[PDB]
Design a protein around this ligand. Sequence first.
Ligand SMILES: Nc1ncnc2c1ncn2[C@@H]1O[C@H](COP(=O)(O)OP(=O)(O)O)[C@@H](O)[C@H]1O
Lengths: 31, 93, 91, 107, 107, 442, 97, 95, 78, 78
Amino acid sequence: ARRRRNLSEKRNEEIKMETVNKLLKKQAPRT
Amino acid sequence: SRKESYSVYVYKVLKQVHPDTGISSKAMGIMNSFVNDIFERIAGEASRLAHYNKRSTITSREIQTAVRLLLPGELAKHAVSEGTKAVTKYTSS
Amino acid sequence: KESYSVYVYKVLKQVHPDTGISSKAMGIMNSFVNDIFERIAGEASRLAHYNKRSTITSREIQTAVRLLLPGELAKHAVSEGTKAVTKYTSS
Amino acid sequence: AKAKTRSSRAGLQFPVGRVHRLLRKGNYAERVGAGAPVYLAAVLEYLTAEILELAGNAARDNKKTRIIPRHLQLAIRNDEELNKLLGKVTIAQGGVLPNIQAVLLPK
Amino acid sequence: AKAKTRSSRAGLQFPVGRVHRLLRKGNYAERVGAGAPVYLAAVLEYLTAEILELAGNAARDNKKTRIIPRHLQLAIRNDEELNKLLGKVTIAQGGVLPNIQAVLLPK
Amino acid sequence: EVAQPKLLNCQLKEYQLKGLNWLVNLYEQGINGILADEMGLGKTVQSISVMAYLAERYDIWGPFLVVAPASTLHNWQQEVSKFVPDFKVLPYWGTAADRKVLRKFWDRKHTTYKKDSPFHVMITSYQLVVSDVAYFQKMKWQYMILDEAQAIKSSQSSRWKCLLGFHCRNRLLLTGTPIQNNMQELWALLHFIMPSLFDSHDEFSENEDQLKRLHMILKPFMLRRVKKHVQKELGDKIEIDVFCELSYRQRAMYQSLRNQNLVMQFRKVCNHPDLFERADTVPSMARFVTDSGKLAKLDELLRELKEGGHRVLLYFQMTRMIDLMEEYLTYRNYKYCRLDGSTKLEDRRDTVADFQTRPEIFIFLLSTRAGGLGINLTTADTVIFYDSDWNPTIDSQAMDRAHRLGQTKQVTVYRLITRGTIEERIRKRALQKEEVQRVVIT
Amino acid sequence: PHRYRPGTVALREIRRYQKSTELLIRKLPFQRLVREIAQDFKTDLRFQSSAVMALQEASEAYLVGLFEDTNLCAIHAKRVTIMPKDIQLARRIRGER
Amino acid sequence: RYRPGTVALREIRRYQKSTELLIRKLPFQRLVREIAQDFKTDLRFQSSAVMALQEASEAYLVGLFEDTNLCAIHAKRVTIMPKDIQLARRIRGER
Amino acid sequence: DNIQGITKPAIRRLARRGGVKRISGLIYEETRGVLKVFLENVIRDAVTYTEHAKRKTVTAMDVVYALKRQGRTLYGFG
Amino acid sequence: DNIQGITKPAIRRLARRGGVKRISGLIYEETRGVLKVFLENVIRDAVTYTEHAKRKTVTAMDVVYALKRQGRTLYGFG
DNA sequence: TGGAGAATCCCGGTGCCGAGGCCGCTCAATTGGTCGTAGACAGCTCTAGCACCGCTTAAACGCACGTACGCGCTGTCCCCCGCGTTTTAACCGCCAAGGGGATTACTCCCTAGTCTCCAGGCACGTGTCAGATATATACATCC
DNA sequence: GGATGTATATATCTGACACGTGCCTGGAGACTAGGGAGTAATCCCCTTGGCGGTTAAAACGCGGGGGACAGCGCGTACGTGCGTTTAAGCGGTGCTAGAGCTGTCTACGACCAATTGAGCGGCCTCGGCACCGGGATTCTCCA
Ligand SMILES: Nc1ncnc2c1ncn2[C@@H]1O[C@H](COP(=O)(O)OP(=O)(O)O)[C@@H](O)[C@H]1O
């Protein structure tokens, strides 16, 4: 039980932080 | 030639509930009509239930959900009981 | 999962060439067509059964339209029906 | 080895075999479960009994030995649950439940 | 040999093959005519056209570019014959035809 | 009085340093205020320096809000990234699908941020501050700069009614033209600054003595400065009016209208006949150039400037006249760039960089209202205004885009006037209004 | 000499005809009407016997039900007499028009 | 302003022009979960299922009021009163 | 003609079975129009089933099926 | 006690869509009883389909079927 | 209350026809076997529904008030009920013609079935453009 | 001499559609089998029609009585508007139940052939019921 649920938070956090950063990179930095 | 009907079976049921009583041909015609009507409805309901679940077979469970949909109130309970009994006896035998 | 969306749009572009059709209104059209299919194929089904016959032909459809659609709508639909089956057979 | 009607095999007066035939020929679906006709037959017998019991009572209450349509009509409209099953049904030769509106009665 | 949709062979924006699949697999009968799906598809296309023609008109009378559920309701409940066909139907987000009894209006 | 902020990656000039001292004293007194430097003295780096000073002394590492017009947002993103590079700077612009994601930076629970926090400065448009006020109202903004603040001059605007209700401590206005129109608009800026003191339309209304009255009254709330006292190294604007006479086609249409509400229709004829109805029974490009007095006279002037190796900023008031002008520039085979309010906010960055990076480009076409604010165009040298604006502040704002700091050539302003027509009336009124504004500051 | 008061005879009638099963339209004129409607739709139509009996059971069942509904519309309007406006209300609420 | 009654008829010309749902969402939803849990405990609902029930529920009530209105007007009243609901139901066949 | 074969006395009776005490005078002509509009709809469907079967004879079954296409189900004839 | 959550204002708006000018005060308690009886009947059916499919969640489709079981066809949701 | 008296129910005797029982027999229901796919099952990903928290602000509520509808009561007068007599056509029991539906045989073409192949349509991206909201400015109008 | 409405611009944004790549599954073509529906010949039943007779009921004509209707007063309920209060609606964070999909394989129902008894048609028949004449009892009505 616990292991899969713990891993879900890390897997979520990674994608959330990257997709957050990608949007700031989308606007501020030239594309 | 050979038109076929449920009059035979209605007589037996009547004999178990009211031993001395009988039944005019017109009343029996009404009973024959009633039985076709209700088979129609319970089969049609069971048909559509199977379709909505994307299933190919009309099992006993479907005929159960259909009784529970068509019949109102206490009728439904008492019928779903007769059904369980019968199928239990068959599965035994 | 399939819908009749595509075809409704094609009919719309041909009858009203400037217009579009909202997502929810398209959902209403997909509901309408499924409904009427069921009604017509159900009447065809029963007509076959009442006549002890094992195939739903095109004659069974035409009698089921004459039973379902009210008044002048029926006449027009049976005309359209008959036209198309003629053209297909002519190929 | 000696035959036993599926009906007797399942304790029922209504004909299990014929019901399996009609479920197969009625295009209700492709494959028809075995117990399906047994259960369906049990419910048809139950409903048949329920009406005829009530009709028998109506006949005795009118001093006669044969059920006729008028007794079925009385039976069916005097029970709320059967009436909710058959509200749209007309019974030929049935007549009407006796009911005069109370404001029509004389002063 | 190059394949030509049944639709094209019969001039029918509606998909005659899909109609034949649904009639065949949906247990309406044991066997289906080759003429069945062509005729039925012609009738669906005709009714689809009728409702969209009336709704298209109602859109342009309201000075708007896009058909919405309000306009389908207004279309369907004006035509005598389509209203008779869809009398039981509720259309989501459709609202009511404007209607006041002349008894309610000012003297 | 105060030292330069240690985080600041550039040296402040003397008058900028004094400006920071004023603002620091305002913050420590708890008073809100207007930095009103004449355009291109460097309000931006002074503004930024307060965020630096707060982040150093009182360890208030944000959150800080810059609200600015659209043309200008990219400028701020660069400026903060350049002059205080430790600060972490978050755009709040772009589509709704973008902005949702950006809100996921905001910390609603820590009231004062510190260096490790997700973002320190947010930069957003006036337009999004209004549309997304529902979401902003939850924040606890620690310092807030409205740049190009005459955006808020109308008290009846949704914008004023929104920004007044932003929950925040210290506010700074920047506006290089504070005094604008009637005294009601001056009330509006004051109220946005300090609601309790300037609470009434009527009492602010409550003549030479009244003007002397005002000069003292404003002294605790505004710092105004002017180029000639500190930017002595850059020569004054050479301004050259040019007259034009209507073409025969213009003259016909103008008489037709005058014989036949028609204010804006007259302004169109004086720009170019083709802004009414174009041409073809075949229409020649030579007729197009000759058919408008302005364009005809402009053709002389452009050709001279090209031969001399100058580069031109050319302003319009009418957007369709930009469309027409590109055609004439295409035929004369001049390289040009275009920027107006319809231009997507990505392309703004690119275009301004292009004209400041690659001197093949001869002409920048700019809309006056979109072009007038923010953008920095030091590589240009000649400004042309093709049409007069009713409001003199807007043209002022516009020509100061050529006359910044770091300009090294003599800025030349041309202005074309169509004689005997609405154009004259308009420039007449604008100059009256400029005298009034100049008197009230003076 | 004797007359019953207006209404007593009618209530006699309600009891008697609410207690009989019999068909209330005369058979031969009903049968003749059904063929008059049929002959619009297809010419030379032989009718089974039980088909016209079934039409008559349905026809009497429809009208006897319509009078029940009509009567409630009258009583609600504080009348005892049914009038054409009552029938039209009942049909409209039941959706037939 | 408006003579006595013109305001009610303005209410009519308002609500017949709009298409919106007329019951408040969250109160409706709570009623549906109250009724449901008699039949089975722990019934999860889909958003779209509660919206379906609400569209159907409002459509039903509105249509009952048109039939109720006709009953009133037939009695030479403009006011709908409980007797009128009960009459419509019995005619329609909802006893 | 034939519709006037449904006599005034007949309607009066039908009404009594529906328990109506007092009957107007204009009811009679309205009732006839109602009954004809009902019969026309049922007969059209019954004749339509008859012609699909290529029979000439309208049977009891055609009528019974016609009525079940109207929500009115008749028990006691097929 | 959630049925009283259907507010008086709301019943009144529904009436107005139905073209009612003036409403009695007793209408409110009838209308609540009416609405609950209708929802009980549809929800019972929807849950009956849901349990047959061995789902725990009542879907839109269950409800749309439950209404076509009762002659009330809801176009707009699958 | 009291006779009157028309109607209703209950009693009883006749007789008739259809409910009910019993005889052959044919065809469909039962027994025992094969086999092939539906679907029960185990396991998985990940959608999305249930909880719970704070804020604006709209609709929900409560009250004081007044006037319009509902409705109880009366006078009028038409029109329906009740009854009587004449008139007519429905019903009955019957004979007959004959059409048309139900059946038996038999043949052929149509549709299901399997296989090979490829393009229509579904899902997901994206971008671009007309419509909706702000905001600025002059000027005419209403006060 | 001022407060506001109107008309025309620019500046922006948001959401509707047009097009796009991709991929995949179901529709199209083509080939054979065999059974359903189409053909005609037959046959007996049940419908259409005529006849003469009885008699139930429909058709017509009167009074007169009581109900539909129109009008009026009056009284209490319903609509209104002003002021306040409470929950709905928004939008979030965040957890995890359970919907929806995959891969197995087993067990069950379609399909066949041989059997045999259930249930249909038909024939005989006698007892439940309809109906009739009579008497006793119950409801209306008016003095
Ligand atoms: N120390 C400095 N180093 C570089 N640029 C500076 C410095 N001081 C001022 N500037 C210039 O100041 C300009 C900003 O002027 P400012 O008045 O703030 O802009 P705006 O008028 O748009 O508000 C920029 O072009 C910037 O390059």
